Design a binder for this molecule. Sequence first.
Ligand code: A3P
Length: 258
Amino acid sequence: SHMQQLPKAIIIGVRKGGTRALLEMLNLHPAVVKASQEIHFFDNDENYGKGIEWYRKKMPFSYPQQITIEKSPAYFITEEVPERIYKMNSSIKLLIIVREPTTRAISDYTQVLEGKERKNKTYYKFEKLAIDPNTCEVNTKYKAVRTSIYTKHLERWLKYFPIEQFHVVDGDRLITEPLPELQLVEKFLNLPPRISQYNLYFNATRGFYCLRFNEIFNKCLARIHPEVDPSVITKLRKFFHPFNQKFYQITGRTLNWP
Ligand SMILES: Nc1ncnc2c1ncn2[C@@H]1O[C@H](COP(=O)(O)O)[C@@H](OP(=O)(O)O)[C@H]1O
């Protein structure tokens, strides 16, 4: 009745799209149980070698009628993950949360920047990295940019899973008006509606929504972005545009990105 079960839904990406926030909010649902921290199972040969059972026992204990959800942003880009997850459970449900490509790229860059300053190291401005100095065009070799070409990655995943097993969460809307996005996830997971407006409240100070559990229990989630040359922002937007249209067409969800 109380056992460690393999996840039936995995948030495979995208980093900086709001994966942590999505996981925390879904955890508001009485039938959802979240795996603590990222386990890095499918994207790490050392751990993947220990077998599915080691993975299973890293999951929290839950009841038969509950669904365990793991969050692992790196899975989206790591080339070998799809086949491994497919082997383990070909009917697994996959969640992808995304936001405006350019914005996500800058957020990605910002985290990498903070990581280097912490260790007291040097780094270049976003522009120097996202734009080829010579041609003055978008640098497609830069991961922050490549990770934002959502369609390219989804294509790999579609080689193993039907589009029906994926659900795309609008991360921009998750920030401004959460409930509707969470309600779609509830239906995607075959869960009855239980998350309510009472569970979410806007914190003008933090600038985001925070979670409200009990009567005296509120919880907010654990960055200052750099100003980018309006000109660079414009080139990136135009660059992503056609990939964005492909994304909407494949997923069925139009996200209205600039
Ligand atoms: N309620 C919330 N609290 C904090 N960040 C939220 C949020 N809802 C969405 N987010 C977004 O989640 C992003 C982090 O994504 P991930 O958890 O996948 O790394 C943040 O990027 P920024 O820090 O650039 O604003 C933030 O914009």
